[PDB]
Amino acid sequence: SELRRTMQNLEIELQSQLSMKASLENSLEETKGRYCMQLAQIQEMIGSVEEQLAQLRCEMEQQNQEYKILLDVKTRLEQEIATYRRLLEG
């Protein structure tokens, strides 16, 4: 009996351990997903900003081209005025 007692106490102790282990396993899974998600979220933000930024950079390019167009007109006009201011006194 005293033997049976210590064997049964061990059967119980194994159960404790076994439990403590199980919750530890789930705690690990919890941790892993948690960081997995948190990371995924920031990854996404970065995506949005990258593309927000890219979209903008593309539009800055379009702008620069437009400015070029305008500028070409402007300088040309200067050369008309130049030939006008020429024909008058010539």
Binding site: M7, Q17, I46, L53, Q63, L70, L77
Partner: protein
């Protein structure tokens, strides 16, 4: 019970054997967890930098676009300024 005993002694052996084993496992899970935290905390720090890097970049772009649009309007102005001079220089040549 002289036999029942041998079976209990062997159980006790099996029992401590596994108890001690689970203890190892737990200890490893424990590590597993600390590594995940350390590893993850880092990956987030990485990302949070790239973000702030971008964030800054984006503000810079935003400002350059501000300036670009302003530079355009000044050009547009001085352009129309000549649209005048031309119209007037024309009339003077149709007399």
């Amino acid at each position: 019970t002289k036999h029942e005993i041998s079976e209990m002694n062997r159980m006790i052996q099996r029992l401590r054997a596994e108890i001690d084993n689970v203890k190892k496992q737990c200890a490893n899970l424990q590590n597993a967890i600390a590594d995940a935290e350390q590893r993850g905390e880092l990956a987030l720090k990485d990302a949070r930098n790239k973000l702030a890097e971008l964030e800054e970049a984006l503000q810079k772009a935003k400002q350059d676009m501000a300036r670009l649009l302003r530079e355009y309007q000044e050009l547009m102005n001085t352009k129309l300024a000549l649209d005048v001079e031309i119209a007037t220089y024309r009339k003077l040549l149709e007399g």
